[PDB]
Structure 1
């Protein structure tokens, strides 16, 4: 036994009490008093209960951004993993990894410089923490990525191997290996 310096410091949630507390509030009480998912987002990302106006905007941003079909990088990454027989959380994690400068992670930088731009601007105008901006697209698109994983599993989709005609093999001319 000895003195321990904490490894981490947390300010948003705790589970040592009767039930988990999100920015000091019990989820059962948040449910009982008519709060929603958008309110829990505000608590865990902003440490305060959103106003009615903010709640309604958060709800709409998430609904509008939930999915944009299977062709886009996040959804396609989740589909590729679903077809490779990967379990849901790990498959969605591969799709989530695609979120960044070119696909849906432009919201934080576009709010900095002024649907990544309307949302980015709106979130800056709501004075939400700068570090939180990408969260709206990450969370919203997780709804769609889970959906695509379920869809492929319902269909028992087989492994994807990209068709040869879809690849430009701009490879080196074949050479013999020289003696070492």
Structure 2
């Protein structure tokens, strides 16, 4: 007779739905918004208004980055094969986590590890170069120190105007001053900014202990921010391919090098 499952986030058993202790009518009366609902459902906290607005801005800036990236491309091909929305969205989401859409989480973890170890920025940069490890959340394929990324500028401006303390972002900005002295494109990118600003929120907004903040990073909250944000764009791409009446795709043979083993091997 003991219960096999435990749950903490939502109670739908009563007359009125509850999100982490707040009845749904109170969620709307308090104007919590999507960011506030995320705070309740993911963290079981009532976050400050500025934190909720920051979460929403992260979801807006990660919403899409065009059709060429791995996941959008896969969703498109899946839509062009005549599949349903869920199948197409998930074909694209399944590309996320490592080389694509994984740098938010990896930047948070890497910069938090360096900061927490007490190593200064200049020594973190030299250590990573000696280990042959790229700094996660640094670098950009097209922007640079005097040609900035506007998503970085908008988010960074918000964080600096509203957050009372941003020690990890400050650390990452010192790292950026150093890396841009090796190559101008080694800027703090949007994945690096979201990653470090999200750690600064969890550690300093007042709703979490350090242990709680560290656990939410370790279990993948930043993978969730990118996944939830970019799901809007991937659904958009699915709908667009259907609106554009795009037919079945087959990749051209001229772009594929076939190098099979020898018959006699």
SS in structure 1 at match of 2:46: coil
Report the Cα distance in structure 1 between the residues aligned to 2:225 and 2:250, rounded to whole angstroms. Answer: 32
2:227 aligned residue? 138
Count of paired positions: 173
In structure 1, C-alpha distance between the alignment counterparts of 2:2 and 2:231, rounded to whole Å: 36
CA–CA distance in structure 2, aligned partners of residues 5 and 85 of structure 1:
46
**What 5-or-longer segments of structure 1 have no aligned partner?**
176-180
Structure 2 residue corresponding to 1:125, chosen from 178, 200, 210: 200
Partner Cα distance (2:250, 2:263) in 1:
24
Q: Does 1:153 align with 2:228?
A: no
CA deviations 1:99-155 (Å, max 9, x no partner) are 111111222221011022111101111125212121110000000000000001111
The match for 1:35 is 32
Q: Offset of 1:174 from its aligned partner?
A: 4.5
RMSD after superposition: 1.7
Deviating 4+ runs (over 3 angstroms): none
CA-CA distance at 1:59 after TM superposition: 1.3
Structure 1 74/29 Cα, relative in aligned 2: closer, same or farther at 3 Å? same
Which among 8, 12, 36 is matched to residue 11 of structure 1? 8
Instruction: Report the 3-state secondary structure (helix = DSSP H, G, I; strand = E; otherwise coil) of the residue aligned with 2:47.
Output: coil
CA distance in 2, matches of 1:38, 1:85: 34
Q: How does 1:65-80 map to 2 (within 5 A)?
A: 65-80=62-77
CA distance in 1, matches of 2:255, 2:36: 45
- In 1, Cα distance between the equivalents of 2:75 and 2:63? 14
| Residue 193 of structure 2 is aligned to residue 104 of structure 1 | no
TM-score (norm 1): 0.89
Question: What do residues 61-83 of structure 1 show as CA deviations (whole Å, max 9, x unaligned)?
Answer: 11111000000011111111111
User: Are the structure 2 counterparts of residues 160 and 28 from structure 1 closer, same or farther at C-alpha, using a change threshold of 3 Å?
Assistant: farther
- CA distance in structure 2 between the partners assigned to 1:18 and 1:168 by the alignment: 62
SS in 2 for 1:16: coil
- Taking structure 2 as the reference length, what is the TM-score of the superposition? 0.62
Separation in structure 2 between the aligned mates of residue 112 and residue 143 of structure 1, nearest angstrom: 26
Corresponding position: 1:170 with 2:167: no
Write out per-residue CA displacement over residues 31-59 of structure 1, whole angstroms, 9 at most, x where no aligned residue. Answer: 23322111111111111122012012111
| Structure 2: segments with no counterpart, 5+ residues | 112-189, 203-212
Distance 2:14 2:257 in 1: 59
SS in 2 for 1:45: helix
SS in structure 2 of the partner of residue 126 of structure 1: helix
